[PDB]
């Protein structure tokens, strides 16, 4: 079953903190970051061990 | 006079003795209460009565 989790991460674009939601679909190995404020979305591959800090880390490197 | 000595006097049924030990032979105090609200809020000047 999918996991819809709220986090305390800051969006890299709109800078609103505590407004990034992480949807981890392990059945298809696809993780999804969403911003509850400005509405952006970032997708990245996840394994079985990953957690909201794993894809949020991949989002920091995808920008820089 | 600890908790276990208290129990022994109950077993003897010596209720009168236990009362005296814990009051007259120790820290007995007189307070005034209000018959309406039941608090110890009474201001009592005894020489002015």
């Amino acid at each position: 079953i999918k996991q819809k989790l709220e986090t305390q991460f800051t969006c890299l674009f709109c800078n609103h903190d505590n407004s990034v939601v992480c949807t981890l679909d392990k059945k298809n190995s696809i993780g999804l970051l969403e911003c509850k404020k400005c509405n952006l979305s970032f997708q990245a591959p996840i394994n079985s061990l990953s957690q909201p800090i794993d894809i949020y880390s991949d989002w920091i490197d995808a920008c820089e | 006079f600890g908790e276990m000595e208290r129990d022994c006097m109950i077993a003897h049924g010596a209720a009168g003795f236990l009362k005296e030990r814990l009051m007259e032979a120790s820290d007995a105090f007189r307070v005034h209460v209000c018959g309406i609200c039941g608090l110890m809020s009474v201001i009592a000047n005894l020489k002015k009565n």
């Binding site: 991460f9 800051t10 061990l49 880390s57 991949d58 920091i60 490197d61 | -």
Partner: protein
């Protein structure tokens, strides 16, 4: 020399002129104990005066300090405090004198010393019992837990001898419950348990076949191999070093947002240091940690396979006694850093005035002197503001009721387990106490069985450098760890020196 230099820096733009301010601590010198009156006059202090006038029998300590001043456009004997002297030791004014003159100093020749004098009161240090460092212990876990066996080790360096960190390897999965029976480890400063295979890959050894060649030295043992099966599959998708190191860094108590380009380089420190620091801390020696990690997993499974009993926590060979020496070093270490930070905080104000500091105004001897006096007088082992959580009762007033009682009191040992925790295991007289602690002498009441007393012929090891022992082992045939293969070495004996696996030898009987 544990932190031998203080360093400052300012990139002068106010014509940049990096001006590093540096202070180096050198030789230590000791003087005999001296009474300095309010007058200013000084004389040698002997103990009888110290008892009578409620003084502290202590020696002034002087430390060489050296200033240096790097400047790039792009001292002498400072007094640091007084250390209480143990009577009849080599630094006590009674050690000489000779029997005739002892009587003139009002000292009794039957008084054998071994204690301190603090504000006129005689204080003796009580030996503190602790578990050995750098040894693997395996224990079983209670029924309502997903863990069944745990391996534990507290790692502590050889120099100084001081604690560093603690590490655990837990085997999950109950009896027919817990599904995949995998194994995860616990690392210092990481919030979550990490599977074993991942940390093996994170050290530079990644294909399965090499990993199993580091742990199990018996290819036939299919029971052991079947228990490592789920560990491979739960860490299969992590197939190289870089994504392994990053998986670690994403848990290690840091800040949020240090990116992959650096979050690896932060985790490489948590692996190089803090994780098993007793083996080595220099770079390019990760072969020793990988080999040691395999040994741990091997020991863990032997207990889970019921081929070896769990370790007996009360076996006296797994125990150590901290006496006056080691106990003072741990306290002196804490206080010397406190003195250091007060020097550092004072330089940042006194150099903004650009005035040469007279050094003697930047060393407040009250930090060490009051620190040692307070802890020896109360027994509170720590900084005064942190009196709780610190251990109590390490120092006690020396019982002088009778002569026998003085001898017993100076030879007492204490196990600091508590009064909380009933049971029996630390309180029982264990078989391995034979000849080392008295089987008869123990207090009645709450301390019964926890406070013990050294047998008449006991001694305590003072400590010895391990470096000459290594040289002797290699001269007589010990082979390095890079030359070792379980297929070729299916029968040789492993050699440990202070708990670190250092080599292998094929003919142990002659050695």
């Amino acid at each position: 020399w544990e932190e031998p230099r203080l360093i400052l820096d300012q990139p002068a733009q106010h014509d940049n002129i990096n001006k590093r301010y540096e202070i180096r601590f050198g030789k230590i010198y000791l003087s005999r104990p001296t009474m300095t009156e309010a007058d200013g006059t000084t004389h040698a202090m002997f103990p009888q005066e110290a008892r009578l006038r409620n003084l502290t029998y202590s020696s002034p300590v002087y430390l060489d300090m050296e200033k240096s001043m790097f400047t790039s456009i792009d001292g002498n004997k400072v007094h640091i405090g007084k250390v209480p002297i143990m009577l009849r030791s080599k630094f006590c004014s009674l050690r000489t004198l000779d029997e005739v003159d002892l009587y003139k100093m009002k000292e009794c020749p039957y008084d054998m010393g071994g204690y301190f004098v603090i504000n006129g009161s005689e204080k003796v240090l009580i030996a503190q019992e602790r578990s050995a460092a750098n040894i693997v212990q395996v224990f079983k876990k209670a029924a309502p837990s997903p863990i069944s066996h745990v391996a534990e080790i507290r790692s502590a360096l050889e120099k100084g001898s001081r604690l560093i960190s603690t590490m655990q390897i837990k085997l999950y999965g109950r009896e027919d419950k817990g599904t995949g029976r995998t194994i995860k480890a616990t690392l210092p400063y990481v919030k979550q348990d990490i599977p074993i295979v991942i940390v093996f890959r994170a050290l530079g050894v990644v294909p399965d076949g090499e990993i199993l060649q580091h742990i199990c030295y018996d290819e036939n043992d299919w029971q052991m191999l079947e228990m490592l099966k789920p560990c491979i599959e739960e860490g299969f998708v992590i197939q190289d070093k870089e994504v392994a190191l990053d998986f670690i860094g994403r848990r290690g108590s840091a800040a949020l947002g240090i990116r992959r380009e650096k979050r690896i380089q932060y985790a490489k420190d948590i692996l190089q240091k803090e994780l098993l620091p007793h083996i080595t801390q220099e770079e390019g020696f990760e072969t020793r940690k990988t080999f040691f990690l395999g040994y741990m997993v091997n020991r863990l499974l032997l207990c889970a396979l019921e081929r070896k009993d769990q370790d007996d926590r009360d076996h006296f060979g797994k125990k150590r006694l901290d006496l006056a020496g080691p106990l003072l070093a741990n306290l002196f270490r804490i206080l010397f850093r406190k003195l250091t930070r007060e020097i550092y905080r004072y330089m940042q104000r006194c150099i903004e005035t650009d005035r040469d500091f007279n050094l003697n105004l930047a060393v407040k001897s009250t930090t060490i002197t009051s620190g040692l006096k307070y802890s020896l007088a109360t027994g509170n082992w720590g900084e005064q503001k942190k009196a709780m959580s610190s251990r109590a009762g390490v120092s006690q007033v020396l019982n002088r009721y009778t002569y026998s009682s003085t001898l017993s009191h100076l030879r007492r040992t204490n196990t600091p387990i508590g009064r909380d925790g009933k049971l029996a295991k630390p309180r029982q007289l264990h078989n391995t106490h034979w000849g080392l602690v008295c089987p008869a002498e123990t207090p009645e009441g709450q301390a019964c069985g926890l406070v013990k007393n050294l047998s008449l012929l006991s001694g305590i090891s003072i400590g010895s450098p391990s470096e000459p022992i290594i040289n002797f082992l290699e001269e007589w045939g010990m082979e390095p760890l890079e030359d070792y293969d379980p297929a070729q070495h299916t029968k040789s004996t492993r050699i440990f020196v202070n708990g670190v696996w250092t080599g292998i030898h094929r003919d142990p009987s002659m050695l």
